[PDB]
Paper text:
Glycan uptake across the bacterial outer membrane (OM) of these bacteria is mediated by SusCD protein complexes, comprising a membrane-embedded barrel and a lipoprotein lid, that is thought to open and close to facilitate substrate binding and transport. Here we show that for both the levan and dextran utilisation systems of Bacteroides thetaiotaomicron, the additional OM components assemble on the core SusCD transporter, forming stable glycan utilising machines which we term ‘utilisomes’. Transport-competent FOS are generated from levan by a surface-exposed lipoprotein, a GH32-family levan endo-glycanase (GHlev), while an SGBP (SGBPlev) is thought to recruit levan at the cell surface. Single particle cryogenic electron microscopy (cryoEM) structures in the absence and presence of substrate reveal concerted conformational changes that demonstrate the mechanism of substrate capture, and rationalise the role of each component in the utilisome.
Initial biochemical characterisation indicated that a utilisome existed, but cryoEM of the dextran complex revealed it to be much more aggregation prone than the levan utilisome. Despite this, initial 3D classification revealed that the SusCDdex complex is intact, (i.e. a SusC2D2 tetramer), and that the SusDdex lids are open. The positions of GHdex and SGBPdex were initially assigned by rigid-body docking of AlphaFold2-predicted models into additional density decorating the lip of SusCdex. However, unlike in the levan system, no classes corresponding to an octameric dextran utilisome existed, which we attribute to a higher propensity of the dextran utilisomes to disassemble/aggregate, potentially at the air-water interface during cryoEM grid preparation. We did observe heptameric complexes, containing two copies of the SGBPdex and a single GHdex (ED Fig. 6a-d), together with hexamers and pentamers encompassing all possible complements of GHdex and SGBPdex (ED Fig. 6e). For levan, GHlev is nearest to the hinge of SusDlev, whereas for dextran, the SGBPdex is nearest to SusDdex. Despite this variation, for two distinct Bacteroides PULs these data show that all OM components required for utilisation of a glycan are assembled into a utilisome.
Author numbering:
A (entry chain A), B (entry chain B): 112 to 602, 613 to 940, 948 to 999
Amino acid sequence: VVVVGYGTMKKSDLTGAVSSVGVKDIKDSPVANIGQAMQGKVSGVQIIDAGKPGDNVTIKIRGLGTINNSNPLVVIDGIPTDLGLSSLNMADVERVDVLKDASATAIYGSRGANGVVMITSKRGAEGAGKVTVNANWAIQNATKVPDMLNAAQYAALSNDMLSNNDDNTNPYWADPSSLGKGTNWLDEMLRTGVKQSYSVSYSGGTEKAHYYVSGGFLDQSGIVKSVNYRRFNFQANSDAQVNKWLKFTTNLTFSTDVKEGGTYSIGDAMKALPTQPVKNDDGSWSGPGQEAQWYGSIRNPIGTLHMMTNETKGYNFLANITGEITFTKWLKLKSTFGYDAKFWFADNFTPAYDWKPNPVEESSRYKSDNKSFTYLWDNYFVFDHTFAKKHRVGVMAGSSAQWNNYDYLNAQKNIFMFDNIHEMDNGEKMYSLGGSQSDWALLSLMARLNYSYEDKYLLTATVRRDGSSRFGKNNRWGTFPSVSLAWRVSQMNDLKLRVGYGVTGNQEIGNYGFVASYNTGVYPFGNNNSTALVSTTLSNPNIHWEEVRQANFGVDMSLFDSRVSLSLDAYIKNTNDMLVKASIPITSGFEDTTETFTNAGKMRNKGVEMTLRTINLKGIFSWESALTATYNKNEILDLNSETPMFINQIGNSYVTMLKAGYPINVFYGYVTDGLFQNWGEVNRHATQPGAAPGDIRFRDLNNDGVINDEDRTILGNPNPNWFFSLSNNLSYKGWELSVFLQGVAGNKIYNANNVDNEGMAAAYNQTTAVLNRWTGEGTSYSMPRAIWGDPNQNCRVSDRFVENGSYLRLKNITLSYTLIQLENARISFSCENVATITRYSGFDPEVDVNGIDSSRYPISRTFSMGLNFNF
Amino acid sequence: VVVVGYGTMKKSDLTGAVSSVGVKDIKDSPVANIGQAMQGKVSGVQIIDAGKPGDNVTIKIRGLGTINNSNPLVVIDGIPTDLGLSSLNMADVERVDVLKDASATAIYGSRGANGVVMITSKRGAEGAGKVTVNANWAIQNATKVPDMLNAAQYAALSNDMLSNNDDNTNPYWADPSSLGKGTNWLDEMLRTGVKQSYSVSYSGGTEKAHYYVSGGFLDQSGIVKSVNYRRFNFQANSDAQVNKWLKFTTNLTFSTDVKEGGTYSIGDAMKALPTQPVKNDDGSWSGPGQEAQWYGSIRNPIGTLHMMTNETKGYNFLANITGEITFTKWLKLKSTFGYDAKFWFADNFTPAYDWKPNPVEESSRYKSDNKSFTYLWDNYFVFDHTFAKKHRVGVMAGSSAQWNNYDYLNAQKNIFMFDNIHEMDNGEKMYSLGGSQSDWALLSLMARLNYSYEDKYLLTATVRRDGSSRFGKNNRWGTFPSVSLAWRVSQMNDLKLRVGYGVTGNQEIGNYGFVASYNTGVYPFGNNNSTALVSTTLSNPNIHWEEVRQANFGVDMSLFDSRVSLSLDAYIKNTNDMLVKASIPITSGFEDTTETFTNAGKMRNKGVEMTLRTINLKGIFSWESALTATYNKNEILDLNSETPMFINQIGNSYVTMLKAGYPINVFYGYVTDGLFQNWGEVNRHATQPGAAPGDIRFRDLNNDGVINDEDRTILGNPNPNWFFSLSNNLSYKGWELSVFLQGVAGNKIYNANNVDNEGMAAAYNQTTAVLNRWTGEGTSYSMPRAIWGDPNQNCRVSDRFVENGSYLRLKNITLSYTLIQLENARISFSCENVATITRYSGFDPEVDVNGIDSSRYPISRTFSMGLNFNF
């Protein structure tokens, strides 16, 4: 069975698009959190990894919905919470269910617009008690590392750059070959990480009672020099039947985590000169020389990493108590109470040290505290009866309530005298101090009806009325109806058609968005000053949710004597009342620069999803496979404006651009043609400031003869079009082998790291791609010359830094064998990210949503061995 | 059965002094916390109430042991914690056991020197499930309120005082009778409190599993105008038998509390003049006039109470997981892990207001955070076998470990502009900021042996080795052996004799007591200054625990066909290695003013305890009774000094005094003889500065003719000698009546409130006892005259302010009757502190340990009605 919110339903009776992940999938994954364990295992959901331990992945369902927060809703044991997925132990997760179509997400009303993720924990089973012990060890190494120049090559490049600009060169760098090799910062900054995990739990069952107690421990070290992560978990579940008409359920969760790490930056490491030794002759940390144009101004990364310490602690508590009263055979009442408390603490300390480029003469300590409490209370009725042995009617109706509180505080001191003893009482000079508070509330009413007719025609209807404090006084309440249909053709072995339609909403618009902002002012009287309030950012009492309408069609098929399955889904999603920039009339007394928003935007998404599974080979050898494909298309309809929006500034210009009729986050820049070879080509070409031979030539889109801002166009679409995956499973006498494939094609990636690593206009270490630069006529046709300051602006926004993002990756290969009194015993060996096929030149093709790569944490490759016991 | 630590034992097999409180006692108590519910119910334990909601009572076992922290040790479900008793729900407490003699407290070693309190929670029972619902409502009112003068009487007193000192009087107070009555501050400051409590729980049982889930809510309002207290509780217990040789136990506890209250003071209320109206004609708060000698300088208490707000929140988490492995039939292994986390938060805010005596022109906010985490891990073996069907041997041995961490932080800001919006971001001026950290650890080894011989001779031996980080490097480890004997004469129906002897220790000496303190200094060089450290309070690497030796004798009897019981206990307790002030030689480079301590003090305590129970009447009427008596004597042997120690300064002099050969905290002051009647008596009496007719005459202890400091002696002993109580219970056809008596006699109380309320030397409101003062020759013989400034120092430390502390109180009278499908239903009516018989003149005879009363929270009288359901 599957969970669809406020109840359970069979898979065969589902009238919407519901996808589930079983225990058999998440059983030997070497990943830490559950988020990385379901990447590519489900259709219609895109998951992007992060890499840093303790972080969470990014989940997007059926493409981007708005230009605002579009993250889905996470529900844990019926409690909608904001807890991160990295804080949940994977060893005690039963199954994960994802709701995509509006026919199933309408039950949540004002929150189920971007999809709902359901997580269910394990429970005890009837019979004798069981004890399960698990362990795992792993090592991690970086996948791909860019190649940088050595001391001699950098010296030659610097000499060429300074000679081309008619500037004095380094007196002792006239013989680059004598310098040698130098120091590699990337090799010293990276190491091999070690990950170990342990878990133990026991469970039992009885016809009237059940119990389950778990607990685990995890320790992980990052691939960089100083990052650590620890996590402790504990969970207890219970279920008792007090009498015939009473029943109780209890779920408790507790977890802690500790995060460490120094001050580091990948960009600074990639820009550190290879001619500088790590340490001086006396052991002190080195630094750049006095001449900025010869040594740069990059502070030593290793010193900052090994001298600065950052720490963070967190504590999380989750509770859930559920009751149930049985009045008659066909009537039940259910009550549920939820609790959730979180705490955060931060601690930073920067010792005072005389750094060569910029010394630090003031040691400081930073601390911060955080709290948050969330409550829930749900009450609803359950009805189920059969009429004339054919008609089945199921009606559920009730209410819900939820509110939250938040607070924080931070401070800082200085001096501290001795570095070893740096408690808060040691310092004397206070630096900063502040805090605030926020809260919100929500109320709702729900009603759902289910109908069946001879197992040949199913009809479901749902209506929900929601009211939140985030909305204005004029749009406090709203209604989100829904309806779906499903019938079977059989009553080619089976066939089923599903049609649905519903309306949902999104309320992630922040808090206190209907209140203007005032700044304190004074008005001089004859001899006294009186404080006055000046209004700014006028109130908007018409702010409400964002409307989303969706239509879905589904087909279910079974072929070859119920051996293979097929699933086809086509959806059209429309977004209305999107928040966009508003227009402020001059007669209103305010200026247009005020940041006021209104519900006027629109967006449209559509695509097709596919799923196919085959189980062909049987007998001694068992072979299974699963093919998943997904297509999506994005389009922006209106933005309530006549001018495009420019965001995501890189360098001194904006990269992305938003315009009606085009996909989101599309690039916008110049187009490169070639390289100048002589003055004759420059003279007869269109005018261009700072033109010289060996520079990049830009095309003239408009026939005006002048290269200017108007010569820009769309470069590429960061949103991919095709998502695909493939899995295989073999089994023969205990031995089993699993191979998983995953890849994404149809997107472009903007490499922002190459802006400074290929510009050759500053004292930054370059990559190996600058060796074949333009040093004369006919020497090269793609790589320009080296010049200090870049008068021609060869590093501007153009198609030079745009690369294909399509890739195919071998995700996981796992081989395990099944073996004092014991019941079960298995040993597993697995690997992650064994190989990758792509044309991208960088750390990893996996980038963020808008396709911009700028000093991201590298993705590692993991080799692990497992172990599993069972008493 | 009873719990004695790391196991259980039958009551009949106990070889030491162990007392227990059953469920039948704590079943209808209207008190909030468990501490107030066991006052006088147990012999050898003294409990003093507090009165303020959310506070904890003071517990002392068999008299004071040291001049330092002598509070006992609290153990909850085998976890030694510092959690207050007010944070525990009384509805789910099974029984409370107290260990007194050293023969039973030696198992805890370095912590069981002042007694151990054991608290056990309820657990599920085999059979069908049960549901229990409880409710209670109550009201509270002050018991006794002192009587103060009115406007006319105060005006007359002020006129007399100013005329006797030859000073100008109030021009418009020449006719006191025209003033009227005035305002009573005590009547306005006090109200009637309301207390309500609810609880609900369910439990079940199975031959292999058990469970128990509880939860409650409590709200209480104090008798003063603005004090509130709320508490939420939740607890879940489980016990499962996975297989034949495995077993697990789990206990979880969670609780929160919120405390409020303004700025108030009983002393200021009792000193406010009755001629000042509460508010002015325009509604603003009133205040004292410009003339200090006519109106005083007492700020308005009502305004401070209603304008200043203080808030405090707390969160507590307690966990306990226990395992057990059975190797053979006569061998078992047990493991236990304990967790404990606490959080505190504070919030204060004082609005700026122009108070008449001292205006406040700066509004400030104060915040504070607290954390504390404690861990435990115990592992020990259990052996039990029978030899030759007669000899029974039980051996237990193992280890233990425990450590703790602590941290805190606080800050403050000012201005805040608007009072309504006072978030931390509003303020601009930082005021203060600080924090610190502390920790400790402990390790131990344990071993206990039990022997039996034909149920006629029992021998028990126990040895424990402890090591803590609080001790010096020279006394890291120690040993605490023990031994006891017991045999039965029968093998007058039964007879049993118990003899025991053991050595325990106390380690409540603080943290980092072996580390000297340094202060930063500078030393001027030729042109620069270098920081230097100056040593102070030299290190003491010889600091260790405090040794206590105790011998106990016990007799158990049964008379009249096992109808009545009797218990006699005699104990002698000696204290060694007590921490006292040390002597610093001049050659050591330090002064005598340094606060250094060493183990040199001694103390001795002894007494007799009695217990008697009768169940005489049977049949339709059931009558039961219990008589408890206790005698104790205290004595101080040595203090490693030749001069008495003076502490507890009141006014401008010290009251208490410590000296060898005398009890602790004994008073020390002058002795009053009478009142001067004429100048002839003054002239022929011993010299006395500021002598005048109508003043108090002090006796001359030494025949020197001069009244000076040497004319002081011991006034009284605050430590009582006799503790007694009596209880009765009736039952007839559901109806039951219970009457409980309790009283303490043999102690003196020093009334520090009368120092300012009877001195008549300042602008303070006086009590009604000043009406019959000395206004002429022969007018009075006890009450002196009224004079401004008190030249004779009539309010000095003497026997004038010493009153008898003996009292007898009617504690509780409870009447309850035993009555839709239901199983049980009862309605209960109860009262608390119905009447009190005493000669003390004050709020209540219940005072602190040293017998000093100074502006304490009044003790209220409670009337309550109960209700109990059972499904």
